[PDB]
Amino acid sequence: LQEHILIILDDAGRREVLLTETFYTIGRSPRADIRIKSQFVSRIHAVLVRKAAYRIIDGDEDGQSSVNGLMINGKKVQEHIIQTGDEIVMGPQVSVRYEYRRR
C-alpha cells in the first residue's frame, strides 16, 4: 500500500512527513500545516491539494504568492502535479522531495 511521503530539508535538517490529508498549507509560520523553517520561505508559501497524487500551487490560501515561488528543475512554476522523485526547490537551501513509497 504505497504511501505519500514528503522529504523536507530546511534550517531544522532533513525530515519526513506522511501526506494524509486533502489540503495542506506550507510555509515558515506556525499557521502552516507543514512548517518549512527558513527565512526564504513565506509564512504560507504554497498549498497541496489531493486530486492519483497531490498538486502544489504557489501562494497562500488567499492566492497571494511569494517572491521566490516553486522552482522545479531550475524553472519557476505556478502549479505542478507532483510526481514521485520531484524536488521542489523553494528558496536558497530549502526544498521538498516527494516519493510514492511501498513498504
Domains of the chain: 1-103 (2.60.200.20)
Q: Are strands 95-101 and 3-10 parallel, antiparallel or unpaired?
A: antiparallel
Tell me how the structure was determined.
X-ray
Nearest Cα to Cα of residue 93 among 14, 5, 18, 2: 14
CB 101 within 8 Å of CB 1: no
**C-alpha–C-alpha distance, residues 16 and 52, integer Å:** 20
* Neighbour count for residue 35 (Cβ, 10 Å): 18
Q: Which residue has the cell 507543514?
A: 34
CB 46 within 8 Å of CB 27: yes
Cell reading at 39: 527565512
First to last CA, the chain: 7
- Amino acid identity for residue 81 in this structure: I
Cell reading at 56: 502544489
Cα dihedral 85/6/87/58 (nearest 10): 130
**C-alpha–C-alpha distance, residues 28 and 12, integer Å:** 11
Complete DSSP assignment for 35-95: E---SSS-TT-EEEEE---EEEEES-TTS---SS-EEETTEEESEEEPPTT-EEE-STT-E
